C-alpha cells in the first residue's frame, strides 16, 4: 500500500544509517589495531 512503501523507505533509510556507521566505526577500529 501507500503506507507500506513509506515505512520501507524510512526503515531502509535508518538501516542505511546504522549500517554506514557500523562499518565506519568497525573499519576505524580495524585500521586502529594495525599497531606496530
Amino acid at each position: 500500500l501507500s503506507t507500506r512503501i513509506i515505512g520501507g523507505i524510512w526503515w531502509f533509510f535508518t538501516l542505511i544509517i546504522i549500517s554506514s556507521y557500523t562499518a565506519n566505526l568497525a573499519a576505524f577500529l580495524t585500521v586502529e589495531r594495525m599497531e606496530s
Binding site: 500500500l1 507500506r4 512503501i5 520501507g8
Partner: peptide
C-alpha cells in the same frame, strides 16, 4: 525488484 515484488503481489492479491 525484490521489494516491489511483494507490492505487486499484494496489488494482484488484494484485488
Amino acid at each position: 525488484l525484490a521489494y516491489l515484488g511483494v507490492s505487486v503481489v499484494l496489488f494482484v492479491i488484494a484485488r
